[PDB]
Design a protein around this ligand. Structure first.
Ligand SMILES: O=C(Nc1nccs1)[C@H](CC1CCCCC1)n1c(=O)[nH]c2ccc(F)cc2c1=O
Ligand SMILES: OC[C@H]1O[C@H](O)[C@H](O)[C@@H](O)[C@@H]1O
Length: 428
């Protein structure tokens, strides 16, 4: 690596978070998680710690449908979960014709409903009112219940209960649990950022009972609206927040999520431009346009192999004619913002993991964390930086991170299993 420019590094060093900063953030998150779990303070808690009713001990529904929506295809699957759970399946991929996917959402779901009808006919299952759950297998890149319910109603020939979907973190946890039974945490680092985890029932005060565990959806994105992050906020963060749809809210998520990451980079570049450290102090009109620097541009800039080809092509699109030095600085700006996201994210997850270790009275905790989302998956080195930081903040914990594999769709079928069983348990 070359000796970097001192004045550039000074500006980028503002993104740095040391271990004591993260431990401070982690402890503040833990207090908000506590406040979310308590009956007395939950109502006023910013981090809601929502009971998911996904329990460690499951009631008996037999057959059900799982409907996996892809980009331009979908899968209908008939599932039977037997007791060690066996996931028995038969399925069918359907392609969506152009008219179906270019019409209204109703017309699209009329088609989906026709395919389900055809599938049920094929398997002679029209005699049952089956519950159906949705899962998503979109190609990763930086409502459906109602639509299907309405479309089934419109057909008026067979009945079927479309069950409420679980939160994406929960689906991630369940899907990953299928592969690894030590998975008791689900994390999403995508456009948004969130985590769920298996809390001790005694700590879930919103649900009576102290036996077993229940999944809690932190909705930790809302952390920060009482100033818990204020000392770590930079000018760029303040501007992002100020121009957002919800100023003052989702401050934690605003530091991590792919929704704002590109914008943060854009503002960093503009400051470097303003200080005559980048593009010889001339920014393009595209660079001075809000949202122009897409988050996908950040991961792409960081994917560059040293060739500067990726970066030069990104910046040329933005009407810039960058020198080699410009490209190198832009990469380091991207690094600085993305590493900070990984740091901030790690403090949250570390807070959860250390809480679990304490709650379970375990000297050494062994645990798997299931993770999904565009940032975590597509951003080069983000998950590695995230992993290393989480582990640094979690002594006495041995943490395995997994991403669920499509496989044969059984992890996804299990998500629908739980969703259907939950709906049943709650009396729909
Ligand atoms: O289905 C479950 N709970 C429900 N609550 C309400 C309705 S159904 C949980 C979920 C599981 C998720 C991952 C963490 C541990 C609990 N669950 C089990 O309890 N036991 C299991 C045993 C084998 C298996 F393959 C899956 C599960 C399972 O998902
Ligand atoms: O998609 C990841 C997360 O994004 C947002 O924070 C949503 O509020 C949350 O429910 C979701 O889990």
């Amino acid at each position: 690596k070359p000796m970097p420019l001192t004045l550039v590094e000074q500006i980028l060093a503002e993104f740095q978070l040391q271990e004591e900063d993260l431990k401070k953030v982690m402890r503040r998150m833990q207090k908000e998680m506590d406040r979310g779990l308590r009956l007395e303070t939950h109502e006023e808690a910013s981090v809601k710690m929502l009971p998911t009713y996904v329990r460690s001990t499951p009631s008996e529904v037999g057959d059900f449908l799982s409907l996996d929506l892809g980009g331009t295809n979908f899968r209908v699957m008939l599932v039977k979960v037997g007791e060690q759970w066996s996931v028995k399946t038969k399925h069918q991929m359907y392609s969506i014709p152009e008219d179906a996917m270019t019409g209204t959402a109703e017309m699209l779901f009329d088609y989906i409903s026709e395919c389900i009808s055809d599938f049920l006919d094929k398997h002679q299952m029209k005699h049952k009112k089956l519950p159906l759950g949705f899962t998503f297998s979109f190609p990763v890149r930086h409502n459906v219940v109602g639509l299907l319910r309405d479309a089934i109603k419109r057909r008026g020939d067979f009945e079927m209960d479309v069950v409420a979907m679980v939160n994406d973190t929960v689906a991630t946890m369940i899907s990953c649990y299928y592969e690894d039974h030590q998975c008791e945490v689900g994390m999403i680092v995508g456009t948004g950022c969130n985590a769920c985890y298996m809390e001790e029932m005694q700590n879930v005060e919103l649900v009576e009972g102290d036996e077993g565990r229940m999944c809690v959806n932190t909705e930790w994105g809302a952390f920060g609206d009482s100033g818990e992050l204020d000392e770590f906020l930079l000018e760029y963060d303040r501007l992002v927040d100020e121009s957002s749809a919800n100023p003052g809210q989702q401050l934690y998520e605003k530091l991590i999520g792919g929704k704002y990451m590109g914008e943060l980079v854009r503002l960093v570049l503009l400051r470097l431009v303003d200080e005559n450290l980048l593009f010889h102090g001339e920014a393009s009109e595209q660079l001075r346009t809000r949202g122009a620097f897409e988050t996908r541009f950040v991961s792409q800039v960081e994917s560059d192999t040293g060739d500067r080809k990726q970066i030069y092509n990104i910046l040329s699109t933005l009407g810039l004619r960058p020198s080699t030095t410009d490209c190198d600085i832009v990469r380091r700006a991207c690094e600085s913002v993305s590493t900070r996201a990984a740091h901030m994210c790690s403090a949250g997850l570390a807070g959860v993991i250390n809480r679990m270790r304490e709650s379970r009275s375990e000297d050494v905790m062994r645990i798997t964390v299931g993770v999904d989302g565009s940032v975590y998956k597509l951003h080069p080195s983000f998950k590695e930086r995230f992993h290393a930081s989480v582990r640094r903040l979690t002594p006495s914990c041995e943490i395995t991170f997994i991403e669920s594999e499509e496989g044969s769709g059984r992890g996804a079928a299990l998500v629908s299993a739980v969703a259907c069983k939950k709906a049943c348990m709650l009396g729909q």
